[PDB]
């Protein structure tokens, strides 16, 4: 079996592209092995229904990413934080795009990307919950953001929630991760007027004999 050892990373972090995990970009496996003390050292976050994202990725058996050309008109792409130091300076999840205002304007973002391929695509995105109201407006201008992601038949709208949280890596704000699978012939459309942590492409999905195992056994 192709045993790929996660070492200090958990599949999810390898997925999102936490810097210490970037070493797994594009990895495949028959059994991904997760260690008991693996840790996350990038922007604090959470995955509503984490067990399912882990399971489906664990079964897809591949982290093959494909960068697509999203066009984020009028917002400042690629936003790092020191909690996710990418080398000596600030960084962020290699697979997400932190969109923030440009100048003094965060325009309504409404983009789309069609699945013209013969395969299913998996889009990982997220929403940012600012610690305080200032941060909210300082970052996205409007006082209440919203992330609406949909395909032709499903939809998901997430409103961010402002508030303090336990300090983690110095931050008391968070990112909430979400996913959207887009079937061939379908089309993805992201619309948001603030707080979006934009995707960069799609991971390819496979159905095989793969899975993940929590183990501290020496390979």
């Amino acid at each position, epitope marked *: 079996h192709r045993i790929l*050892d996660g*070492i*200090d990373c958990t599949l999810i972090d390898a997925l999102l592209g936490d*810097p*210490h995990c*970037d*070493v797994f970009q594009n990895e495949t496996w028959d059994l991904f092995v997760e*260690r*008991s*003390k*693996a*840790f996350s*050292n990038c922007y604090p976050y959470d995955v509503p229904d984490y067990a399912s994202l882990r399971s489906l990725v664990a079964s897809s058996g591949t982290l093959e990413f494909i960068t697509e050309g999203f066009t984020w008109t009028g917002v400042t792409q690629n936003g790092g934080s020191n909690a996710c130091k*990418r*080398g*000596p300076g600030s960084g962020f999840f290699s697979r997400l795009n932190w969109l923030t205002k440009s100048g003094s304007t965060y325009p309504v973002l409404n983009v789309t990307m069609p699945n013209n391929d013969n395969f299913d695509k998996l889009y990982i995105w997220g929403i940012h919950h600012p610690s305080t109201n200032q941060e909210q407006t300082s970052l996205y201008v409007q006082a209440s953001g919203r992330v609406t992601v949909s395909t032709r038949r499903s939809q998901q709208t997430i409103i961010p929630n402002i508030g303090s949280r336990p300090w983690v890596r110095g931050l008391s704000s968070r990112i909430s991760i979400y996913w959207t699978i887009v079937k061939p012939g379908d089309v993805l459309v992201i619309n948001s007027n603030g707080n979006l942590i934009a995707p960069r492409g799609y991971f390819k999905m496979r159905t095989g004999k793969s899975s993940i195992m929590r183990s*501290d*056994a*020496p*390979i």
Partner: antibody
Amino acid sequence: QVQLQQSGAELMKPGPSVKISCKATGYSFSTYFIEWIRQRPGHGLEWIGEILPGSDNTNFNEKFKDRATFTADTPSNTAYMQLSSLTSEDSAVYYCARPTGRLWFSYWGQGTLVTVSA
Amino acid sequence: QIILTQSPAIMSASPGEKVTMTCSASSDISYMHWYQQKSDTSPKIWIYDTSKLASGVPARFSGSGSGTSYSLTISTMEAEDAATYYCHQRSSYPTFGGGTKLEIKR
């Protein structure tokens, strides 16, 4: 979170033995080999040996065999190295390190200055 | 046992100057690992598996080799690169090179 904390520097007379410790935290101790390398002033790096905690498959560099002694305690998550019958030639900085099978993940301890003298 | 004679022993270069240091095995190896070491600090993995960069290692670094001879080249020296570089064979009882002092000139 990975951190190998090593014991303080030493000073052992010529002939006895020093015992260096290295506490691992941030990763499952019994999963990876802990290796021992030393730095003698103007000599480079010298691979001493290694141990796989919990199995104690220890592999010595011939040069330190039955001289060097590797042990590792799971509950305390601490590996240890004992070098006996010292000469001034064993005065150096000893690092412990978890390089795993993928060196993208290698981690060396701060170092333990072992001074051999009367 | 698989002695690495990594040898430009000292190097003096100017900013932007390309640099290349070689390391040779006294037999045959599969991958070369390069640890960088600046003063009063533990070695840091810089380039593993002959050509892959560790996290954070600037892009101006690269590595190659495949048999006995291996190398570590730097497109354009920067002041921050002045360190001491060691090669590391892992194909048995691991061994390290003698290092290469990379001194910048200013």
